[PDB]
UniProtKB/Swiss-Prot annotation:
Interacts with SERPINA1. It is an enzyme of class 3 (hydrolase). Binds 1 Ca(2+) ion per subunit. It is found in: Secreted, Extracellular space. Is inhibited by scorpion cyclotide trypsin inhibitor TopI1. It comes from Bos taurus (Bovine). The gene is PRSS1. InterPro entries: Peptidase_S1_PA, Peptidase_S1_PA_chymotrypsin, Peptidase_S1A, Serine_Proteases_S1, Trypsin_dom, TRYPSIN_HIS, TRYPSIN_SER. Its EC number is 3.4.21.4. This is Serine protease 1. Keywords: Calcium, Digestion, Disulfide bond, Hydrolase, Metal-binding, Protease, Secreted, Serine protease, Signal, Zymogen. One of its GO terms (biological process) is proteolysis. The keyword Hydrolase applies. Subsequent cleavage after Lys-125 leads to alpha-trypsin. Further cleavage after Lys-170 yields pseudotrypsin. A cleavage may also occur after Arg-99. Not sulfated on tyrosine residue(s). Residues 1-221 form the Peptidase S1 domain.
Length: 223
C-alpha cells in the first residue's frame, strides 16, 4: 500500500497472509474454513496466516493453518487477468473471535463513489522498494467505469473495477494482491493489478466480487 496508514493490530480481522516460506499475497476469510484470494496468487504449499499484524514477529493472536484444496476460477485468464479469483479451503476450521473474523459476501454490487478500505503488506513505494512488517490500510473510492476504461483502454472487463485516485500518490501495490477491498462492511473487491503503483492516471484494478457470489457459494457447498 502506497500512501496509506498503519491499520493497527487486528483492526482488519478478516485479512490473511498467504505464506510459502514468506508472505506472497493477501486474502480474505469468508467463513471459518474458506479464504478468497486472487487466482494469480496460486501456488502449491500454501499456509494461511490469520490474526497477523507484524508478519515477522509472533505477537500472540496468530493462527497458522495449511490449505487442503485450492480452486482457481474455471475461466481465469492469466494473460488478461479476467476472473482473477481463487478459493482456498483450510485443513481445519479457524477459531473466530473479535481479532479473527469473517467478512460477509455482498448481496449487491457497489456503485462508483462508494468509499472502501484496502489493506495489505505490500510495497509502500511507487519508486523503489520498502516492504512493511505491519498491516497498512488505505481508504479509496470506487471510480466510474468510464474513468476506469479511459485509464486502461482495451483492458477492463465487466469483472473488474478501478478504485483509488487519478492524481496518483495512493494505491495498492506488489504484495497486496489477493487482499480485500471492503465497502460498507462487505467484500466487494480483490486486489488484482495495475500499471505500477500510485502513478497518475493509473489507479488500481480490482476483481469485482459481486459477479462471483453464486460460484463461491456453490463451490463451498460442494467441497
Ligand atoms: Ca505475527
Amino acid at each position: 500500500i502506497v500512501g496509506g496508514y498503519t491499520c493497527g493490530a487486528n483492526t482488519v480481522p478478516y485479512q490473511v497472509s498467504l505464506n510459502s516460506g514468506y508472505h506472497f499475497c493477501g486474502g480474505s476469510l469468508i467463513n471459518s474454513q474458506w479464504v478468497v484470494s486472487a487466482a494469480h496468487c496460486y501456488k502449491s504449499g500454501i499456509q494461511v496466516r490469520l490474526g497477523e499484524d507484524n508478519i515477522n514477529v509472533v505477537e500472540g493472536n496468530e493462527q497458522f493453518i495449511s490449505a487442503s484444496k485450492s480452486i482457481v476460477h474455471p475461466s481465469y485468464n492469466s494473460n488478461t487477468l479476467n476472473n482473477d479469483i481463487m478459493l482456498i479451503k483450510l485443513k481445519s476450521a479457524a477459531s473466530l473471535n473479535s481479532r479473527v473474523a469473517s467478512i460477509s459476501l455482498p448481496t449487491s454490487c457497489a456503485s462508483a463513489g462508494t468509499q472502501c478500505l484496502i489493506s495489505g503488506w505490500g510495497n509502500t513505494k511507487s519508486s523503489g522498494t520498502s516492504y512493511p512488517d505491519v498491516l497498512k490500510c488505505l481508504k479509496a473510492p470506487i471510480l466510474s467505469d468510464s474513468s476506469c476504461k479511459s485509464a486502461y483502454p482495451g483492458q477492463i472487463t465487466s469483472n473488474m473495477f478501478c478504485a483509488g485516485y487519478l492524481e496518483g500518490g495512493k494505491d495498492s501495490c506488489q504484495g497486496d494482491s489477493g487482499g480485500p477491498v471492503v465497502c460498507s462492511g462487505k467484500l466487494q473487491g480483490i486486489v488484482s493489478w495495475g500499471s505500477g503503483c500510485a502513478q497518475k492516471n493509473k489507479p488500481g484494478v480490482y476483481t469485482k466480487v459481486c459477479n462471483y457470489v453464486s460460484w463461491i457459494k456453490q463451490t463451498i457447498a460442494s467441497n
